[PDB]
Amino acid sequence: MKRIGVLTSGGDSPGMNAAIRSVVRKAIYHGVEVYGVYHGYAGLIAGNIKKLEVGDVGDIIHRGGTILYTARCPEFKTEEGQKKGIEQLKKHGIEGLVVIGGDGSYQGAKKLTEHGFPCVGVPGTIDNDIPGTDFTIGFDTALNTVIDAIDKIRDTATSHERTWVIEVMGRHAGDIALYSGLAGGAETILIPEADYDMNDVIARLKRGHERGKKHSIIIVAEGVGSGVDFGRQIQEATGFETRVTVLGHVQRGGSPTAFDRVLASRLGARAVELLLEGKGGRCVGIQNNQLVDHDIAEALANKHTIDQRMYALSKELSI
Amino acid sequence: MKRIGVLTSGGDSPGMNAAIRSVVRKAIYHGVEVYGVYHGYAGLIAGNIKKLEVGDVGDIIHRGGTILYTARCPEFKTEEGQKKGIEQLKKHGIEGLVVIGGDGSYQGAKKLTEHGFPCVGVPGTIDNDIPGTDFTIGFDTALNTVIDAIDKIRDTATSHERTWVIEVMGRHAGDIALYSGLAGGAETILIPEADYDMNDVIARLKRGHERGKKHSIIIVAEGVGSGVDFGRQIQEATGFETRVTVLGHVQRGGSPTAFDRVLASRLGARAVELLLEGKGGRCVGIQNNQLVDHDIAEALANKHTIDQRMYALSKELSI
Amino acid sequence: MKRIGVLTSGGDSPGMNAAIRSVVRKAIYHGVEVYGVYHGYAGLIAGNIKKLEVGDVGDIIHRGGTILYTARCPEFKTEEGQKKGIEQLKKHGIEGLVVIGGDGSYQGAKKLTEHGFPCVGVPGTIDNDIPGTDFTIGFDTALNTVIDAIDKIRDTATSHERTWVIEVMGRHAGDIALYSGLAGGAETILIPEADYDMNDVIARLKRGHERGKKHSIIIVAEGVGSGVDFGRQIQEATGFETRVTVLGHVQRGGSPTAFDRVLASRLGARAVELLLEGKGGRCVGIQNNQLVDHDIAEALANKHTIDQRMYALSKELSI
Amino acid sequence: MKRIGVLTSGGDSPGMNAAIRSVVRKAIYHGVEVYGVYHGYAGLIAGNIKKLEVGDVGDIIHRGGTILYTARCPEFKTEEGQKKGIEQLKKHGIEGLVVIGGDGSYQGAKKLTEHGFPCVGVPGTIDNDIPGTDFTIGFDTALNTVIDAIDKIRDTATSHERTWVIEVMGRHAGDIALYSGLAGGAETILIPEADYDMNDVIARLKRGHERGKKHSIIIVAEGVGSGVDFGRQIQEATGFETRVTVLGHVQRGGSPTAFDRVLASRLGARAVELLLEGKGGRCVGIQNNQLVDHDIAEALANKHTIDQRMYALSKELSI
Numbered sequence A, B, C, D: 001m002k003r004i005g006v007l008t009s010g011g012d013s014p015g016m017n018a019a020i021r022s023v024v025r026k027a028i029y030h031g032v033e034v035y036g037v038y039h040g041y042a043g044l045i046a047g048n049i050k051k052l053e054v055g056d057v058g059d060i061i062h063r064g065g066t067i068l069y070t071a072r073c074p075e076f077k078t079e080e081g082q083k084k085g086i087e088q089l090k091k092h093g094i095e096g097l098v099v100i101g102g103d104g105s106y107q108g109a110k111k112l113t114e115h116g117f118p119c120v121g122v123p124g125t126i127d128n129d130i131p132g133t134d135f136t137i138g139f140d141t142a143l144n145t146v147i148d149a150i151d152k153i154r155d156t157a158t159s160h161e162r163t164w165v166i167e168v169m170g171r172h173a174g175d176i177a178l179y180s181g182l183a184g185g186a187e188t189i190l191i192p193e194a195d196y197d198m199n200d201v202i203a204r205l206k207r208g209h210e211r212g213k214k215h216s217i218i219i220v221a222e223g224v225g226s227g228v229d230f231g232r233q234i235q236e237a238t239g240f241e242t243r244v245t246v247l248g249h250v251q252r253g254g255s256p257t258a259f260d261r262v263l264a265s266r267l268g269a270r271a272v273e274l275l276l277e278g279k280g281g282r283c284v285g286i287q288n289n290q291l292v293d294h295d296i297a298e299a300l301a302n303k304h305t306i307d308q309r310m311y312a313l314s315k316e317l318s319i
Ligand SMILES: O=P(O)(O)OC[C@H]1O[C@](O)(CO)[C@@H](O)[C@@H]1O
Pocket: A011, A102, A125, A126, A127, A169, A170, A171, A172, A252, B243
C-alpha cells in the first residue's frame, strides 16, 4: 500500500496516542503515508481527513485521549452509510485503515472489510474486554488510576474507621474491578463474572469487624449495580459508618503507564504490518505474552471471561 | 511543661501525620513527653491514650491521614461529658493538648482552656476554611489531587468534545474550587462566595462552542448544590453531550504534597512552642507567609473568605 | 499598549506555560495582540517573533517547559545586540514586553526599559533565587519532584538500612535543598546559607545509627558541593554502607503543581496589567501572600536568603 | 506442614511487601502459621525470627521496600553457614520457607533444599533479570518510575533543544532500558543484549537535528557503560549541548503499580501452595501470562534474554 489511514472510535482511552504514533511512524518507516481520520467514524463519512506528517505524532507518545478525536456515528450502521465513508476514503487515495477503539470499532472494521476495504482493529479501551486479547490499550492505565484512588481513599478510610465502597468502571466487565480490587487489598470485589450473596458479604464485614480492622473497602464493578445503593444496603444491614465514591471518567484520562505505551506501540505497529502484508479484516491483540492477530468475526464470536482463580484468590487473601 | 498530648479531631487531611511528628519531635527536643489521644475527642473521653516515642512518629511524614485516628463525639460538645475529658487527662498527668483539625475541633480547645487545660489548635482540613490562616494543612494536597483529576478528565473531555461538571469538596468554602479551577484552567468556577447565573454561563458556555473549543470544564464547589444537577441542567439547555464527575473523598486521602509537609511541620512545631512559652488557648496558622498566633476565640469569630480579585481573574482568563 | 510580546529566557521551569497562557489570555482580554519571541532574547535578535492566538495558548496550562522555547545568548549583553533587539521589536510593531525566566534575564529586562521600551519580568525558575518574590514559577513543582524521589529512596534505603546522600539543584541558593529535606524527612541538610562541620554530620549519623534509625537521608544542596563526594567522605569515616543519588533535571520538568499553576497565572496576568498601566522596568512577584511589583533595580540590590528559623527547625525535628 | 517462614534477599523492589502479604494470608487461610525471617539470609543465620500475625501484613500492599528487610550474606554461601541456618530454622519449628528476591537468593533457595528443606522462589527485583518468568516483582513499577522521569526530562530537553542521555539501571539486563526507552520514546536505546555502532548513533542524531528533531533522548542501560561518558562523548562529536541524568535508586523505591501488586499476590500465595501441595526446590513465575513453576536448579541453569523484536521495533519507531 501507498497510503493507509487511522481512526479511533469508541470511548477514548490512555495509550491510543501511543498506538497512533506507532501506526504513523511504523508506517512512515516502510515508506507509507498515513492519513488521520478525525472524530471516529463520524468524520470518516463527513470527510474529515488530514495527512498525518511524522511531525504530528512525535511528542504525544505520553498523552491521554486521541489527537484524532472519537465520536459516535449512527449513520455508520447502514450499508448506505459505510459506503459513503468507503468513498471519502478513496477520495483521498487511502487504501487501508487502522481502527483504534472499543468493540464497536470492530463492527465497522468488519463491515468496512466486507465491502472490500482493508481494515484492522487495534483494541483500545479501559474496560479490557475486547475478545482475542488478554489486555487492551488503556487497561493498565485505568487500573493504576483506580488503585491509586483506593490508596488515597484507604488513608481516610482508616482515619475514621469507616467502611468504603468504590465504584469502578468497565461496564459489563469485572476486569478494572477484579485486577484493581485485588491490587488494592479490597476486602471484597463484586463483579459480573461471578456470583455474590449480599448477605454473606455482610457477614464477613461483621466478622472481619470483630477481628479488629474497623475500616473495610468494597470494590464494586459498575457492571453489577451501583455503589450508591450497595452503600446504603451495607450501612443499614450492619450499622458501620459508610461513604461511597464513584471514581468516574478519571479512569479514562491521564498519561498512559509503561505497559500501555508499549502495548499501544507494539499493536499499533503490528497493525500497519498486517495491512502492507495484504491481510484485512484482522484485529491485533496480545495473548499469553504474544502478538496475535485474529479474524474480527471469529474474534468477536468468543466471550470475555476473567480468571476465576483470581476472584478466588482475592477471597482467601482477605479474612 | 512535663507532659503534653496530641489528637486529631474532625475530617482527616494530608499533613496531619506530618504535624503530629513535628509535635512529637519538637517536644522531645525539649525533654517533654508527649501522648496520643487516639480517636479524636472520642478517646479523650474513652481514655484511649498512649505514650508516643520518637520512633513512632518517625517514617510517617509522607503518610496521608492520621495515625492517631479521628471520630466524632457529641459527649464532648456538652459539659458533663467533657468533664471526663479533663480527668482522663489529669489521671495521665497531661498538662497541655495540641489539637489538629477543622473549625469544630477548635471548640474542644476553646472550652478545655476555659477549663484550665492549655490547648493549641493546628489547622488540619482540606476545605481551607479555618479562620486565622491563609492555608490549612491538607489544602495544597487536596487542591492537587483535584487538578490531577481535572487533567485526566480534560483528556477524555477533549477526545469526545464533551462538556464537564466536576464536583469538588470544601463544604461551605470555595477554595478547593476557585484555586483548582484556576489551576486546571476551567471555563467556569462556581463557588458560594460569588453570585453566578446559569443564564450568564450557558451564554458564554455556548459562544465558546461555536467559536472553536468544543469542550468545557465546570468546577463546582460542592457548596452550591450538586454537579449532577448542573450536569442535567447544562445538558437540557444546550443539547450538549455532558458528563459529571464527583471526585469526593479521594480529595481527603493521599500523600501530602511538599507544601503541606513543610507547613504541617512548621505549625505543629510553632504550636508545641507555645505549650511551653506558656500561652495555651491559641491556634497556629501561616498568615501573610508568617507563623502567627491567634486567640482560638478571637479568631473563630472571624469568617473565612476568598480573594475576589482571584475569582475575577478566573473570569478574565477563562473565555 | 496595543501589541505586547512575551518571551522566556533562562532555565525552563514547570509553570512558565501557565503564565504564557495567562499573559496572552489576559492581554487579549484587553484587545492587545500578543506575539511570542522564541528562544529567549536570542530569538529577539534573530527576529524570531510570531503572533500568538488564544488558541495557541489553549491547553498548555498543565505542561512543563516553555512552548516558546528557551536559549542562551551572550549577544544581548552587548548593546550591539540590544540594538538589533529593539529593531526586531519595532519592526513587527511590538510596543511592550514580558520577560519570564531566571534573573539572568531581568538584566536584559531592565536595559530594554532604558532603550525606552516597556518590560515587566516574571520570576520563573526552580532555584527560587530571584529577589523580589518569596517564590518563583517552578519552585513548588521542583520542590515536589524531589520529595517524590526522597519518598522513593526512603523505601530502598530503609529495607537496606543504608545511609543516603541526595543532591538537589538550586545553584548557589539553598531553598530546594531546605524545603526538600524538611518535607522529605532528611536528618541533615547542607546548604550554602548555613555552615556545617562534616565532623558533626558524622557525629550524628554515627549516634543515630547506634540508636534506632539504621538509615538516613542526607540532602545536599548542589550549591555547597556534590553528593558523590560527601557520600564518599561519609562511607569512609562511618564505614556505613552508602549510596549517592543525583536528581538531575527531572527537577526541571514535570507538570506544574497546584500552587504553581495558580501563581503563574496570577503573576502573568498582573504582568500585562503593568505594561498597560504605563509602568515599566518593573517585575512582579509574591511577597507576604500579596501580589507585589518592584523596579528591576532596587530589587536586584537586595539578596535572596533562606529562612534560618526553618533550617534550625530542620535540625531540631531530626535528632 | 503447620509452620513456614518467608524472607526477602537481594536488592529490594516495589511489591515485595505485597508479595509478603499473600504468603502470610494464604498461609493463615490454610491453617499454617507463617514466621517472618528478617534481614534475609543474614537474619536467618542470626536467628532473627518473629511470628507474622495476620495484622502485620495489613496495610503494606501498597508499600515499597520490604517490611522484613534485606542484606547480602556470604556466610550462607559457605558450608558453615548453610548449617547455621538449617539449625535456626529447625529451632523455631520452621518446616518450609519462602524466598523472594533476585537470582542471588535463589541459590540459597536451592541450598536449603538439598539440606532437606522445602523452599520456593519468588522473582523480586526491578531488573527483570531472573530466569523462569517473563516478569519479576518490581519491573513494572521501575518501568514507570523511569518513564515518568523521561517525561520530565523531555520537557527541559525540549525547551532548550538539548540532546539527552539517561542512565537507567538493571545491572546486566537491558529490560529496564528496553521498555523504558520504547515507552518513553527514546530516539536511541543502548543495551547489553544488542551491539551498537556508537558511530551510526551519532550519524542519526546529526540527521535529526536538521529535520526539526532538534532534541533527542538516549537511554543507556547501566550494564553498557556510564551515560556520563556517552554524554560528553556525544557532545564532543556532535556539538549539541548534552545533559546526562542517572536516575539512581529512585528506580528501586516508591509504592508499586497495579501490576506488581497483582503479580506478587498471585506469586506469593502460589509459593505457599507448593509448600503445602508437597513441592519444594521450585520457583514460581509468570511465563506467557500463566502462573507456572519450575525447579530452582534447571531454572537457574537457564539464561535470561530480551526480545530482539522489541529492540528492532524500538529502532523503527525512531528516526
Ligand atoms: O460516558 P460514556 O462516554 O458513555 O462512558 C461510560 C462507559 O464507557 C467507558 O468509559 C468505556 O467503555 C466505560 O468504562 C463505561 O461503562
